[PDB]
Design a protein around this motif. Structure first.
Motif, PDB file in Angstrom:
ATOM      1  N   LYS A   1      -3.334   2.975  19.921  1.00 48.00           N
ATOM      2  CA  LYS A   1      -3.427   2.520  21.299  1.00 48.00           C
ATOM      3  C   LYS A   1      -2.523   1.356  21.692  1.00 48.00           C
ATOM      4  O   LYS A   1      -2.636   0.836  22.803  1.00 48.00           O
TER       5      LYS A   1
ATOM      6  N   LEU B   1       2.671  -1.964  25.386  1.00 44.41           N
ATOM      7  CA  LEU B   1       2.805  -3.080  26.296  1.00 44.41           C
ATOM      8  C   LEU B   1       4.155  -2.941  26.973  1.00 44.41           C
ATOM      9  O   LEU B   1       5.152  -2.573  26.346  1.00 44.41           O
TER      10      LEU B   1
ATOM     11  N   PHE C   1       6.245  -5.289  28.617  1.00 45.14           N
ATOM     12  CA  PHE C   1       7.252  -6.283  28.286  1.00 45.14           C
ATOM     13  C   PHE C   1       7.812  -6.133  26.883  1.00 45.14           C
ATOM     14  O   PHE C   1       7.089  -5.836  25.929  1.00 45.14           O
TER      15      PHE C   1
ATOM     16  N   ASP D   1       0.727 -11.166  34.677  1.00 44.43           N
ATOM     17  CA  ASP D   1       0.701  -9.930  33.923  1.00 44.43           C
ATOM     18  C   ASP D   1      -0.761  -9.647  33.556  1.00 44.43           C
ATOM     19  O   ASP D   1      -1.215  -9.770  32.418  1.00 44.43           O
TER      20      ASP D   1
ATOM     21  N   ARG E   1      -3.321  -7.152  32.394  1.00 49.13           N
ATOM     22  CA  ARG E   1      -3.294  -5.959  31.571  1.00 49.13           C
ATOM     23  C   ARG E   1      -4.693  -5.470  31.211  1.00 49.13           C
ATOM     24  O   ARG E   1      -5.607  -6.238  30.907  1.00 49.13           O
TER      25      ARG E   1
ATOM     26  N   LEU F   1      -9.149  -0.397  24.759  1.00 54.57           N
ATOM     27  CA  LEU F   1      -9.678   0.146  23.509  1.00 54.57           C
ATOM     28  C   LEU F   1     -11.033  -0.445  23.143  1.00 54.57           C
ATOM     29  O   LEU F   1     -11.986   0.250  22.787  1.00 54.57           O
TER      30      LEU F   1
ATOM     31  N   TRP G   1       3.199 -16.172  32.014  1.00 55.67           N
ATOM     32  CA  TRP G   1       4.231 -16.815  31.234  1.00 55.67           C
ATOM     33  C   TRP G   1       4.879 -17.927  32.038  1.00 55.67           C
ATOM     34  O   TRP G   1       5.301 -17.736  33.176  1.00 55.67           O
TER      35      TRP G   1
ATOM     36  N   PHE H   1       9.007 -15.789  24.566  1.00 55.24           N
ATOM     37  CA  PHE H   1       8.886 -15.600  25.999  1.00 55.24           C
ATOM     38  C   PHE H   1       9.385 -14.208  26.310  1.00 55.24           C
ATOM     39  O   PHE H   1      10.247 -13.723  25.584  1.00 55.24           O
ATOM     40  N   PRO H   2       8.957 -13.521  27.342  1.00 54.37           N
ATOM     41  CA  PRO H   2       9.729 -12.435  27.907  1.00 54.37           C
ATOM     42  C   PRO H   2      10.602 -13.031  29.011  1.00 54.37           C
ATOM     43  O   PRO H   2      10.098 -13.434  30.058  1.00 54.37           O
TER      44      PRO H   2
ATOM     45  N   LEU I   1      12.754 -15.499  31.166  1.00 55.90           N
ATOM     46  CA  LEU I   1      12.257 -16.150  32.364  1.00 55.90           C
ATOM     47  C   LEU I   1      13.349 -16.408  33.390  1.00 55.90           C
ATOM     48  O   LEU I   1      13.104 -16.954  34.466  1.00 55.90           O
TER      49      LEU I   1
END
Lengths: 146, 185, 121, 201, 180
Positions: A12, A15, A17, B43, B45, B49, B58, E154-155, E157
């Motif tokens: 499962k 994501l 990102f 974000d 989410r 599960l 972030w 980080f993703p 920025l």
RNA sequence: CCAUUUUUGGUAAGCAGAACUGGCGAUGAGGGAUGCUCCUAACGCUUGGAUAAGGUGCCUAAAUAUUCGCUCAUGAGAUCCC
RNA sequence: AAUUUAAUUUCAAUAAAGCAAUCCCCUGAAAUUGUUUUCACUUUCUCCCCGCACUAAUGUGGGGAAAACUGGCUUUAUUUC
């Protein structure tokens, strides 16, 4: 006892990102005189600035630059706390990151543009000639198909 | 300011959550509730599960952290609403005059006549998806119920504001319909 | 009506004192000055507080009195009369003249420049 | 020239930069067709923009409004008026530049066949921070009562559905073209085919 | 030469003394480290402090040494703490602030940037008293404490900012702000 | 007659009166949107160069430059003399 | 686009060796007009224990251990890897 549940987790895990700014990720410089070279993110100095080090094949030297001047790539290999030029060179050779980058679509787009730009007038005519040949055959098939 | 800010939002039990396309939507026993967050920077989410919802931002700043708590509180309400249905109990106070309560439009609009002996009509239709019922339990009580916490609260408030009269004192002029009790069925 | 006093606060024009050159000078409104228990010693005055100017504009006789009396009342109401001494550190001395020929004497203010202390408790 | 007409889809753009960038080019001499002009953004809030427009509305020539300023209510004309502000329209070069600009509400059919371009430096989420308040010009115009939005929305949906069938046809035709192209790589000369593979297509 | 572009300001060790006299045949030697844009500025800053601290002036003194300081490692991060005295519109205020950098010079650059940005304080109105390396555990500032955690990621920025060549005025399709 | 600094009278004044110097007047080119005095700079006629004050989103010539901050304003704020 | 010989705490690898294990290059914290002495500080895609999936994360919060792969220094050669 942490090892008993893992099939569910693997099944499962998704994501949206990706390409996280975590040490040892490959990055493409998009600004300044070093632009178009690829490089690793070593350490992170502060929120806008990071310690970057090119591959010794790409040849952009180890340096502090703003993260804003990078576009991060898919690959990352986990690394230790600091760099070392030799250990980075050995690990990069071991994992074959340039080959993986080149195999990836963006690497293909870039290498095709680089070759095409540097090509000779005869090579350019040959490409024109080949496309002209191709069009003739394709049109012949399309007519035949009707 | 902060590098990472997170929230882990309690399992919505027996009910169907969906997080796709910024308009977070939960369906359940009593209804389907929709609520956009497209303007928020989060974000959010669906953990799924093990159930739960996880909200993460972030590079947050204190306004954004507050928004994470506001949204989680709203999600908790949304779950509560579809599972068990929100009831706003409004008690009617009067020192003297009869106030005639005619619920019309199949339990959707309370029509009010004769507040402070006015001999004039105050109409208040409900917001979408919410019931206006009467109490058999006690004479002055009015039930405003529905899945959405906002529409019942707004409808009840609108009923209160519609009745309440302008001008002169209010301190000994306590008459009117007021929200007493926020519950679920 | 009585001039805005706003004019007086600026330190401009040559300094003019109460003097034999006046031949008739109007009295300052402040005359009471200090209050509290005058006789006291270093052990008793464990606390000594100062009011230091920061603006450095000239201060009227009437303003000094008004500020002081307000202070005195707050001290007496809070801590009792005989348990403090409130000292007026500054003294008015700059005689100011107005017109409606040089002007005629009508105001008295304190000269105020860097680091001056107005009151002490 | 640079291109026969630049056609610009105003969706997602901020007013000032789009006008400013167009104006320097417009002076240089390109003719530019702005399409979907209602869907341009002003960076102020809905209230803030309403306030500014109310003040603009207040302006008048006291002795005779017949020779006064104009309170233009069409979003295209608002854009045009702003671009005129960024031109020296009292000059002959300015008059000519002002004539060169074309502005269109929604999508008109002579330009629905045509390609549309965008200005990346004028995009709202490129140039305005995400949490800041803002407002679409057509919405603002509607807000100050000048609604011609519902008609455009009806027109756009009808046109967009037909366009969707056109896009599927174009995609289908390209798939078939790719199949024919790939077939005929075998039919051409090997050495030439190898050269064509080597530099890509 | 290199290829290197951005960011310049340097560190100087300066040593000086009072001019020898009959009255004092063994002048006091005074040393200081000074962050400056050049050696002439560094001498002038030293002289301003020599004037403020001692009754020495350029006309009554002598330079013993001035030499540029180079940081021990250019690419190893340290937490530098700096204590400043700066002047407001009304008067004087003290501050001690903490900066993560690989260079003391970079930390000073961040400090000047902060004093300008957060207070509108001009270069003239700042006095740097000591910049020194501070241990990770000791640090007061939360913005520096967050960096010092075990793991960080980080993703992305930051918005793109391509080369001049590719900043062209028209785009063929609508773009995206950043990849996911 | 104007400006800085020092300055006397007058509540103050683009008011009255000075001191030292520099201007303007009798003198202008470029900037300060604009403008007798501010800034840069004083001028035969031309070509080329490189700059000053000053700027470089568009009007309007040069960067939608880089780099770190701060800032949302139901009348934000924007450069000495102003 | 370069380029010479100087100057001024530059480096970085190369492949054979060692040395210590929060220890070292460093940098902390401590005990009149001198030095010096103390213990504080690395990693980890190692292992274990508790929470037992608790994560921002191909993990994770806390407690411990492990090592020198990692890094640091001393060397010996080597510079067109």
């Amino acid at each position: 006892v942490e090892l008993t549940e893992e099939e569910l987790y693997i099944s499962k895990k998704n994501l949206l990102f990706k390409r996280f700014v975590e040490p040892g990720r490959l990055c493409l410089i998009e600004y300044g005189p070093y632009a178009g070279k690829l490089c690793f993110i070593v350490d992170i100095v502060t929120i806008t600035r990071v310690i970057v080090d090119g591959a010794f094949i790409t040849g952009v030297p180890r340096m502090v630059i703003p993260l804003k001047r990078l576009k991060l790539l898919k690959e990352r290999i986990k690394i230790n706390k600091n760099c070392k030029s030799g250990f980075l060179r050995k690990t990069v050779n071991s994992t074959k990151v340039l080959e993986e980058f080149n195999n990836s679509k963006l690497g293909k787009k870039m290498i095709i543009k680089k070759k095409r730009d540097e090509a000779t007038d005869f090579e350019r005519f040959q490409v024109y000639f080949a496309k002209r040949e191709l069009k003739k055959k394709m049109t012949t098939i399309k007519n035949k198909k009707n | 300011k902060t590098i990472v800010s997170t929230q882990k939002v309690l399992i919505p039990e027996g009910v169907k959550v969906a997080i796709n396309a910024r308009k977070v939507t939960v369906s359940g026993k009593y209804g389907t509730l929709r609520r956009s967050f497209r303007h928020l920077p989060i974000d959010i989410r669906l953990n799924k599960l093990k159930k739960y919802i996880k909200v993460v931002m972030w590079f947050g700043v204190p306004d954004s952290l507050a928004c994470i708590r506001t949204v989680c509180t709203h999600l908790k309400n949304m779950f509560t609403g579809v599972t068990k249905k929100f009831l706003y109990k409004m008690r009617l106070v009067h020192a003297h005059f009869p106030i005639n309560s005619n619920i019309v439009d199949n339990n959707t609009r309370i029509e009010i006549r004769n507040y402070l002996g006015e001999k004039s009509v105050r109409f208040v239709k409900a917001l979408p998806g919410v019931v206006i019922e009467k109490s058999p339990n006690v004479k002055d009580e009015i039930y405003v119920s529905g899945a959405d916490i906002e529409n019942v609260s707004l409808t009840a408030a609108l009923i209160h504001q519609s009745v309440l009269c302008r001008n002169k004192d209010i301190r000994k002029f306590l008459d009117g319909i007021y929200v007493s009790e926020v519950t679920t069925v | 009506g009585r001039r805005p006093a706003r004019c007086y606060r600026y330190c401009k024009n040559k300094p003019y004192p109460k003097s034999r050159y006046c031949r008739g000078v109007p009295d300052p409104k402040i005359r009471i000055y200090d209050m509290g228990r005058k006789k006291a010693d270093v052990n008793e005055f464990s606390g000594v507080v100062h009011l230091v100017s920061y603006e450095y504009e000239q201060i009227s006789s009437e303003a000094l009195e008004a500020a002081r009396i307000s202070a005195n009342k707050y001290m007496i109401t809070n801590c009792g009369k005989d348990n403090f001494h409130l000292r007026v550190r500054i003294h008015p001395f700059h005689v100011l003249r107005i017109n409606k020929a040089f002007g005629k004497p009508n105001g008295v203010v304190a000269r105020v420049d860097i680091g001056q202390v107005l009151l002490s408790i | 020239m640079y291109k026969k007409e630049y056609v610009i889809d105003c969706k997602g753009h901020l007013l000032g930069r789009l006008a400013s960038l167009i104006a320097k080019e417009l002076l240089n001499g390109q003719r530019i067709v702005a399409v979907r002009c209602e869907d341009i953004n002003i960076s102020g809030s809905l209230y803030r923009n309403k306030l500014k427009y109310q003040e603009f509305l207040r302006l008048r020539t006291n002795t005779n409004p017949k020779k006064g300023p104009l309170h233009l209510r069409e979003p295209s004309k608002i854009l045009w008026r702003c671009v005129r502000g960024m031109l020296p329209h009292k000059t002959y070069k300015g008059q000519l530049a002002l004539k060169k600009l074309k502005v269109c509400v929604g999508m008109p059919a002579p330009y629905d066949k045509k390609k549309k371009y965008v200005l990346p430096s004028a995009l709202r989420a490129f140039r305005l921070k995400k949490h800041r308040r803002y407002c679409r010009l057509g919405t603002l115009s509607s807000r100050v009562g000048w609604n011609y939005d519902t008609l455009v929305k009806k027109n756009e949906v009808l046109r967009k559905q037909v366009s969707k069938a056109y896009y599927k046809k174009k995609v289908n035709n390209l798939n078939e073209k790719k199949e024919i192209k790939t077939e005929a790589l075998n039919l051409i000369n090997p050495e030439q085919r190898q050269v064509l593979e080597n530099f890509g297509y | 030469i290199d290829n290197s572009l951005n960011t310049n300001i340097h560190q100087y060790h300066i040593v000086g003394r009072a001019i020898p006299t009959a009255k004092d045949k063994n002048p006091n030697v005074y040393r200081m480290c000074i962050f400056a844009k050049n050696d002439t500025n560094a001498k002038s800053r030293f002289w301003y402090f020599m004037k403020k601290i001692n009754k020495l002036k350029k006309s009554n003194g002598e330079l013993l040494a001035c030499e540029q300081i180079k940081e021990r490692f250019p690419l190893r991060v340290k937490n530098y703490g700096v204590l400043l005295r700066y002047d407001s519109r009304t008067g004087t205020h003290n501050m001690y602030k903490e900066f993560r950098d690989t260079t003391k010079e970079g930390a000073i650059a961040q400090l000047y940037s902060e004093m300008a940005g957060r207070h509108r304080a001009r270069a003239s109105s700042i006095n740097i008293i000591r910049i020194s390396e501070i241990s990770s555990s000791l640090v007061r500032r939360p913005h520096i404490k967050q960096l010092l955690k075990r793991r960080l990621r980080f993703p992305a920025l930051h918005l793109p900012t391509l080369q001049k060549e590719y900043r062209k005025k028209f785009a063929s399709k609508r773009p995206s702000t950043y990849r996911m």
